[PDB]
Design a protein around this motif. Structure first.
Motif, mmCIF file in Angstrom:
data_model
loop_
_atom_site.group_PDB
_atom_site.id
_atom_site.type_symbol
_atom_site.label_atom_id
_atom_site.label_comp_id
_atom_site.label_asym_id
_atom_site.label_seq_id
_atom_site.Cartn_x
_atom_site.Cartn_y
_atom_site.Cartn_z
ATOM 1 N N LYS A 48 35.997 -64.701 21.256
ATOM 2 C CA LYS A 48 35.818 -64.210 22.615
ATOM 3 C C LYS A 48 34.748 -63.137 22.571
ATOM 4 N N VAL A 49 33.862 -63.131 23.565
ATOM 5 C CA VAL A 49 32.812 -62.121 23.620
ATOM 6 C C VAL A 49 33.449 -60.742 23.573
ATOM 7 N N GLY A 50 32.945 -59.903 22.671
ATOM 8 C CA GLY A 50 33.397 -58.525 22.548
ATOM 9 C C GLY A 50 34.524 -58.318 21.548
ATOM 10 N N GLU A 51 34.997 -59.400 20.940
ATOM 11 C CA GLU A 51 36.104 -59.303 19.983
ATOM 12 C C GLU A 51 35.644 -59.786 18.625
ATOM 13 N N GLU A 52 35.905 -58.997 17.586
ATOM 14 C CA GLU A 52 35.431 -59.366 16.253
ATOM 15 C C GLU A 52 36.130 -60.602 15.708
ATOM 16 N N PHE A 53 35.363 -61.435 15.016
ATOM 17 C CA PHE A 53 35.918 -62.619 14.345
ATOM 18 C C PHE A 53 35.235 -62.863 13.009
ATOM 19 N N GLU A 54 35.848 -63.703 12.182
ATOM 20 C CA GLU A 54 35.281 -64.019 10.880
ATOM 21 C C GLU A 54 34.629 -65.385 10.928
ATOM 22 N N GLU A 55 33.459 -65.485 10.310
ATOM 23 C CA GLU A 55 32.793 -66.761 10.101
ATOM 24 C C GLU A 55 32.030 -66.656 8.785
ATOM 25 N N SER A 90 31.779 -61.000 12.513
ATOM 26 C CA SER A 90 30.808 -61.212 13.578
ATOM 27 C C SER A 90 31.302 -60.634 14.892
ATOM 28 N N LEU A 91 30.370 -60.257 15.763
ATOM 29 C CA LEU A 91 30.716 -59.754 17.082
ATOM 30 C C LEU A 91 29.646 -60.208 18.053
ATOM 31 N N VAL A 92 30.075 -60.892 19.108
ATOM 32 C CA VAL A 92 29.161 -61.440 20.100
ATOM 33 C C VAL A 92 29.179 -60.559 21.350
ATOM 34 N N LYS A 93 28.001 -60.256 21.881
ATOM 35 C CA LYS A 93 27.911 -59.600 23.181
ATOM 36 C C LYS A 93 26.962 -60.372 24.096
ATOM 37 N N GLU A 145 23.099 -62.848 31.445
ATOM 38 C CA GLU A 145 23.986 -63.840 32.032
ATOM 39 C C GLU A 145 23.966 -65.138 31.235
ATOM 40 N N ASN A 146 22.813 -65.453 30.655
ATOM 41 C CA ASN A 146 22.641 -66.749 30.006
ATOM 42 C C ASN A 146 22.402 -66.672 28.499
ATOM 43 N N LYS A 147 22.625 -65.506 27.913
ATOM 44 C CA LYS A 147 22.274 -65.309 26.514
ATOM 45 C C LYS A 147 23.267 -64.405 25.787
ATOM 46 N N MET A 148 23.827 -64.910 24.691
ATOM 47 C CA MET A 148 24.721 -64.111 23.865
ATOM 48 C C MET A 148 24.046 -63.770 22.547
ATOM 49 N N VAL A 149 24.425 -62.639 21.959
ATOM 50 C CA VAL A 149 23.839 -62.248 20.693
ATOM 51 C C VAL A 149 24.942 -61.839 19.746
ATOM 52 N N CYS A 150 24.828 -62.275 18.502
ATOM 53 C CA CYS A 150 25.885 -62.047 17.535
ATOM 54 C C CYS A 150 25.372 -61.255 16.358
ATOM 55 N N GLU A 151 25.947 -60.082 16.127
ATOM 56 C CA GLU A 151 25.641 -59.346 14.904
ATOM 57 C C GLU A 151 26.659 -59.640 13.813
ATOM 58 N N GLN A 152 26.167 -59.775 12.592
ATOM 59 C CA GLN A 152 27.019 -60.129 11.464
ATOM 60 C C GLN A 152 26.951 -59.022 10.425
ATOM 61 N N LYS A 153 28.080 -58.756 9.772
ATOM 62 C CA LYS A 153 28.155 -57.820 8.658
ATOM 63 C C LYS A 153 28.896 -58.486 7.506
ATOM 64 N N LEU A 154 28.319 -58.469 6.303
ATOM 65 C CA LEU A 154 28.954 -59.150 5.171
ATOM 66 C C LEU A 154 30.303 -58.502 4.870
#
Ligand SMILES: *C/C=C(C)/C=C/C=C1/N(C)c2ccccc2C1(C)C
Length: 137
Positions: free
Chosen positions: A66-73, A83-86, A90-99
């Motif tokens: 879910k956007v705004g909630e951390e998850f593992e991938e 990972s965390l998606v924000k 309106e039409n674009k999501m961005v995901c930052e990842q941390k090892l």
């Protein structure tokens, strides 16, 4: 708008090079960039909740977030990450990842939907950018 659909790849640019920056050895790269590895993407979106399945002829991987909630991938090269998606727009999501363990290139991905219904997936590792474009079957 709605990211849901069965997406098929119509453009792919710079994917082998992204793999090199991630340190994927050449034997695996040849396999990974072969037609047998061509990705198909299934998305089910309900509001901010996403299921994304990415499959090839030999592999299948599912993420749920879910956007705004951390998850593992996993990173593109298969290292576990948080990972965390924000929403960037309106039409674009961005995901930052941390090892989860160790060090490595800074990685991220973005997904955006154009007005003409193309899905653009961008992946970054440090200064290298790979872009894949899909359309709905
Ligand atoms: C992200 C792309 C992957 C994993 C593989 C794509 C490989 C190919 N090949 C070999 C090909 C040949 C013609 C047209 C398109 C392609 C595609 C980029 C799917």
């Amino acid at each position: 708008p709605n990211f849901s659909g069965n997406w098929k790849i119509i453009r792919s640019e710079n994917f082998e090079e992204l793999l090199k920056v991630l340190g994927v050895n050449v034997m695996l790269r040849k396999i990974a960039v072969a037609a047998a590895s061509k990705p198909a993407v299934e998305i089910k979106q309900e509001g901010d909740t996403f299921y994304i399945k990415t499959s090839t002829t030999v592999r299948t991987t599912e993420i749920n977030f879910k956007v705004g909630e951390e998850f593992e991938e996993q990173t593109v090269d298969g290292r576990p990450c948080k990972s965390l998606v924000k929403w960037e727009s309106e039409n674009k999501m961005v995901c930052e990842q941390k090892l989860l363990k160790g060090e490595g290139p800074k990685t991220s991905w973005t997904l955006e939907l154009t007005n003409d219904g193309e899905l653009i997936d961008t992946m970054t590792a440090d200064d290298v950018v790979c872009t894949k474009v899909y359309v709905r079957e």
